[PDB]
Design a protein around this ligand. Sequence first.
Ligand SMILES: O=C(CCc1ccc2ccc3ncc(-c4cnn(C5CCNCC5)c4)cc3c(=O)c2c1)NCc1ccccn1
Length: 299
Amino acid sequence: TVHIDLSALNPELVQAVQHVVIGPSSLIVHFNEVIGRGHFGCVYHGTLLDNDGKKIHCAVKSLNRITDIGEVSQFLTEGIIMKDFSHPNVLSLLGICLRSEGSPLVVLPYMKHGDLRNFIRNETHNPTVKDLIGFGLQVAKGMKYLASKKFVHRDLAARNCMLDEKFTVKVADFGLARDMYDKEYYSVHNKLPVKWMALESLQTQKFTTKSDVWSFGVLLWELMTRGAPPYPDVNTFDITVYLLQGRRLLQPEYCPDPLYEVMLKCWHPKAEMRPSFSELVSRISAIFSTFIGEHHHHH
Ligand SMILES: O=C(CCc1ccc2ccc3ncc(-c4cnn(C5CCNCC5)c4)cc3c(=O)c2c1)NCc1ccccn1
């Protein structure tokens, strides 16, 4: 029932939204069919009528019970930040629907297989070790692209990646993503994923591509453990001390030794000493191509 006053938003943000607008008549939000949850609300199945009149299956993000303009602005930015994304391992934006009343709607392509964490946890799907390394390589390529556009993700985790009908892994949620401009960092001004955060980010609240590399390492560990929760016997509040003591996530059972070395490199206490995403793509690609095991998907 909300009425959003657009004159209360930053003009550059409103113009950006206007450019990716979806006509209210072209979208059916299947509001009785929940499919996920972002940082600002739930995600639903949707049907999008395209420019050529074809029905497109989509995922629609909405704001859950809106109270203030700041929340609307952050939610719209989580859609606008994705507008120029064009990479096979990065989810694209289909558009934004803003009706006369109610929450704005961020429209994304539907990803057949759902989130990466749930996919690997499914005992029947049972991805092989090589399949898991391949998923890790795909995420690395998406992050290499994001890093090249000077965006800091800040919330990289398996649950934030999706798999499409061809098993292509795409970095999908950008609810905490920020443009670094020419600064090479983002510091918090205005619910943080503690067990995926770099030690320096937990201490200073400053995020960089190198802090995303740390999160990537944890995502690789989630892959190799088939979606186990990290540090299960460490409380969220005791993580900083645990990490300052030099302690790290242990080698997963079926994980190749060179891939565990890659994870360790991602968690170096000195951010400058961590590999770049370009270096991670090269290293993981060599591990992937030399691991001769059973494999299903195309990486
Ligand atoms: O929700 C999130 C992050 C937010 C986010 C970001 C982008 C997307 C984009 C598309 C999408 N496509 C397909 C399916 C889907 C859902 N199910 N299926 C099929 C249905 C038939 N069975 C096989 C799966 C396809 C779900 C989604 C989403 O909900 C989604 C959600 N992470 C997940 C998360 C969120 C919170 C806690 C844990 N995990």
